[PDB]
Write a protein that binds this ligand. Structure first.
Ligand SMILES: CC(C)(C)c1ccc(C(=O)NNC(=O)Nc2cccc3ccccc23)cc1[N+](=O)[O-]
Length: 256
């Protein structure tokens, strides 16, 4: 074997901790998550292999060290301008890649449960990678679905059924949060503090008052998709196979 190839220098703090690690020999860059629940995160991470999900390389105990795909483009969070969002073609491309990642996770029976721009990272080519499976869990195993009951996520992104029902299907919840992310990308603001009866902004949406912000900043094509995603009844909410049939989803917008 080549000497020293197992040595990584921690050269930059990425967040809190997660450190940018660079290989002493090869100079390969990886992200190292250093945690002082972790057992489950590592286990699910071992199931993951998709171009729009952060790659898991391995772990070692010292304190646990998770070796993760490094995403040099940073968080999608930083691409969203307050009150503006981003160019619609860029948002569509990110949304395509987000759906690809979420379709993959759901296909292997995993739900992320906390999709939001801080957890969507970008590589050097601005390809989107779903990040951080510390709240993720199994919702399908041996081809049998298990209903969720744990309240978790981030309130502005969380689906209404989590707030009102004891149990709920996992997949519509991830679809909902993706819709909130799409709204954020297109409007540069979140539509409500939380999807509750007591929240005026959410009531306005259910009353279809789309002459109000953020909705009036959003073109009718993507808005129509959002009308199908941000549906209160999770059983009536659009599924991803049908999102893939949506007019805006399929609209040519962005050059290569
Ligand atoms: C709450 C939401 C809507 C979702 C949000 C709002 C703002 C930010 C944010 O401030 N992101 N950080 C940036 O630096 N955004 C910007 C990108 C490009 C041009 C800009 C020009 C001037 C100022 C900021 C700009 C992040 C998020 N969010 O995802 O949680």
């Amino acid at each position: 074997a080549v000497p020293f190839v197992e040595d990584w220098d921690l050269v930059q703090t990425l967040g809190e901790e997660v450190q940018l690690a660079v290989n002493r020999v090869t100079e390969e860059a990886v992200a190292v998550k250093i945690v002082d629940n972790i057992k489950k995160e590592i286990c699910i991470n071992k199931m993951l292999n998709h171009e729009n999900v952060v790659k898991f390389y391995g772990h070692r105990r010292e304190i646990q060290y998770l070796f993760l795909e490094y995403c040099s483009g940073g968080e999608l969070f930083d691409r969203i301008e307050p009150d503006i969002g981003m160019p619609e073609p860029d948002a569509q491309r990110f949304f395509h890649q987000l759906m690809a990642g979420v379709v993959y996770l759901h296909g292997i029976g995993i739900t992320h449960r906390d999709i939001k721009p801080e957890n969507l990272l970008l590589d050097e080519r601005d390809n989107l990678k779903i990040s951080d499976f510390g709240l993720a869990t199994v919702f399908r195993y041996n081809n049998r679905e298990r209903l969720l009951n744990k309240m978790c996520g981030t309130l502005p992104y969380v689906a209404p059924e989590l707030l009102k029902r004891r149990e709920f299907h996992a997949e519509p919840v991830d679809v909902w949060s993706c819709g909130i992310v799409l709204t954020a990308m297109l409007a540069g603001e979140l539509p409500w503090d939380q999807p509750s009866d007591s929240c005026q902004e959410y009531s306005d949406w259910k009353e279809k008052k789309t002459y109000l912000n953020p909705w009036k900043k959003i073109d009718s094509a993507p808005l129509a998709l959002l009308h199908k995603i941000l549906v209160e009844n999770p059983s009536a909410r659009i599924t991803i196979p049908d999102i893939k049939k949506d007019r805006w989803y399929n609209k040519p917008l962005k050059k290569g």
